[PDB]
Amino acid sequence: SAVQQKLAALEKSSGGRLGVALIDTADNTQVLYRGDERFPMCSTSKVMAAAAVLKQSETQKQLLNQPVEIKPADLVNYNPIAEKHVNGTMTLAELSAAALQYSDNTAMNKLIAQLGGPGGVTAFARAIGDETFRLDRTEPTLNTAIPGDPRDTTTPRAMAQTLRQLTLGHALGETQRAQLVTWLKGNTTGAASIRAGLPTSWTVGDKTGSGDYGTTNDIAVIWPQGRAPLVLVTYFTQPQQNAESRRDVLASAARIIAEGL
Numbered sequence: 001s002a003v004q005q006k007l008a009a010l011e012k013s014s015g016g017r018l019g020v021a022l023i024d025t026a027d028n029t030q031v032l033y034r035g036d037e038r039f040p041m042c043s044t045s046k047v048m049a050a051a052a053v054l055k056q057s058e059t060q061k062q063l064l065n066q067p068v069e070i071k072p073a074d075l076v077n078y079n080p081i082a083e084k085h086v087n088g089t090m091t092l093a094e095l096s097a098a099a100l101q102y103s104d105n106t107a108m109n110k111l112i113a114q115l116g117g118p119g120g121v122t123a124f125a126r127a128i129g130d131e132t133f134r135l136d137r138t139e140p141t142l143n144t145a146i147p148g149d150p151r152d153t154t155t156p157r158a159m160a161q162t163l164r165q166l167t168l169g170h171a172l173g174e175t176q177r178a179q180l181v182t183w184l185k186g187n188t189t190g191a192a193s194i195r196a197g198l199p200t201s202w203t204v205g206d207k208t209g210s211g212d213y214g215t216t217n218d219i220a221v222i223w224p225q226g227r228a229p230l231v232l233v234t235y236f237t238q239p240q241q242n243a244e245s246r247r248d249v250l251a252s253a254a255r256i257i258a259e260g261l
């Protein structure tokens with residue numbers, strides 16, 4: 001109840017809409033704030049897409065090594081890794097790593113194309129028991145984050161359960177799960193978000209996202225020192241389209257969640 005009140009006060013002082021889902025896998029206890037409201041996933045959807053290609057690699061041995069042609073025309077709005085390889089090639093493993101750890105949008109589009117389009121990512125979500133996730137568009141338009149728009153959205157509760165199944169459960173094979181966790185732990189973009197609200201001694205693997213309407217997201221699997229892991233989804237979006245990012249709000253939500261643990 002105190003956590004519910006503090007998250008409501010944080011949201012009230014934030015000027016936006018905050019969604020939080022915590023799963024404590026020590027006892028499966030949950031904490032939800034707007035946990036069943038939809039939020040635009042933005043770059044956090046990349047987790048699903050990479051996991052889906054990892055799932056494909058369970059029945060294609062050499063799929064993650066398969067070269068993919070990077071063309072000049074493939075570049076979109078944020079391609080910090082892919083631009084080095086245009087007119088060249090990247091493997092699907094490199095593309096997955098670039099998408100997850102550097103949030104390369106061209107790499108995400110290559111992952112999406114490897115799955116047959118956004119519906120293939122949604123189909124993977126359905127195949128691992130996620131009924132809420134929907135991916136509808138490619139990069140960059142999946143980040144429009146328009147209020148009330150269900151496209152490219154999920155709920156905090158669904159994303160927390162799914163992230164647990166992908167990183168801690170058995171939605172993926174053991175090697176694929178380990179690769180996904182390795183990728184998440186090497187994220188370069190997460191230090192200002194959930195991780196900033198957690199004690200420094202805790203290991204975090206996470207994927208951030210941001211979009212229009214000041215949309216500021218983070219999804220994390222957290223290994224606290226000396227405790228079983230947590231799954232924490234913090235989604236945040238604001239009323240006006242041009243709003244600035246608010247990673248401090250994600251950090252504050254993580255601090256509130258962390259303090260009740």
Ligand SMILES: *C(=O)N1C[C@H](NOS(=O)(=O)O)CC[C@H]1C(N)=O
Pocket residue numbers: 042043044077078102103104105140143189207208209210211
């Ligand atoms: C995903 O949210 N995006 C791709 C890339 N990464 O964002 S993050 O660094 O906040 O994870 C650029 C921002 C954003 C986008 N432009 O769509």
